[PDB]
Structure formats: C-alpha cells, structure tokens
Amino acid sequence: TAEVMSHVTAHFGKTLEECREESGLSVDILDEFKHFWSDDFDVVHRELGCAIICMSNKFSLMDDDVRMHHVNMDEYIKSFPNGQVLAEKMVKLIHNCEKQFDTETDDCTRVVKVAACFKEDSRKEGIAPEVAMVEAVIEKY
Numbered sequence: 001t002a003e004v005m006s007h008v009t010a011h012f013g014k015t016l017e018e019c020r021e022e023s024g025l026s027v028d029i030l031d032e033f034k035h036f037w038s039d040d041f042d043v044v045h046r047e048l049g050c051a052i053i054c055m056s057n058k059f060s061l062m063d064d065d066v067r068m069h070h071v072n073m074d075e076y077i078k079s080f081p082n083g084q085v086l087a088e089k090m091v092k093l094i095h096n097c098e099k100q101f102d103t104e105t106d107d108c109t110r111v112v113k114v115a116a117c118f119k120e121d122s123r124k125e126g127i128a129p130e131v132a133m134v135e136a137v138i139e140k141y
C-alpha cells in the first residue's frame, strides 16, 4: 500500500547524502529523497540512477548484474510495519519495469528509467505515497 511505501521510502532515503558524491547527484537535482514522489518531480537524470544503485547497495537490494535482488528486496520490505501486504506486488511491479529496459546496458541509465516506470506504475496500482506521508514517518524521530 501507499502507507507501507511511505515507511520504505522514508528509511531507504536516509542513504542519499552518503551516496551523493560518487553519483554526481547535485542538490539542485534532488535535495531530499522524499521528493522522488512529488507529482511534478521528473525521474530522469542518470545521476539519480547512480545514486539509487548506491543506496540499494547499502541494503543488498541489487543482484550481481545490478538488477533487483528479489529475495533481499522482499526481506527488506517485510522489515517494515505491514510490509507483507506490499512485498509481492512491489517486486512484481519493479521486475516488470526492468524487463522493459533490459536493452539499456548502462546501469545508472537503466536504473533511472526503471525508477520512472516504477513511479508511474506505483501510481496506477495504488502504492505511491504522497510526500506528506513520507514526511510523517520521518517526523516521528
């Protein structure tokens, strides 16, 4: 659900700043990872794709070929409250996007294209949070 995705996003986003330099991702492109979900944030920059690799690697969410590791992704998602309701759908949805971009061999570019597809399909399927839901989780600390 969108509520569960808010919790996943809020945690996943904590590795933005440590990944910023190696990805070449300007603050001007993305200042806080929660804005990934803004209606009018365009998910396009190769640097954001590099950042997403870097952030995923932190939680072993990538397989040897820089695609989603399905098992580790499922385990990550179920580590959040009610995570089991989202885990099957989210893997299926991401993997479907990956197949559409399998002919992009540049890893950063492939991953940003996959991220954009995942955002769009997440809205269609009802698992996209609003920024305010993401902020509400972050704000409990």
Ligand SMILES: CCC/C=C\C=C\CCCCCCCCCO
Residues within 6 Å of the ligand: 008, 009, 012, 052, 056, 066, 067, 068, 094, 098, 110, 111, 114, 115, 118
């Ligand atoms: C991914 C869990 C954190 C929540 C939102 C972040 C979304 C951006 C990226 C979606 C996953 C992309 C990994 C697939 C790479 C295929 O080569």
Ligand SMILES: [Mg+2]
Residues within 6 Å of the ligand: 065, 066, 105
């Ligand atoms: Mg490769």
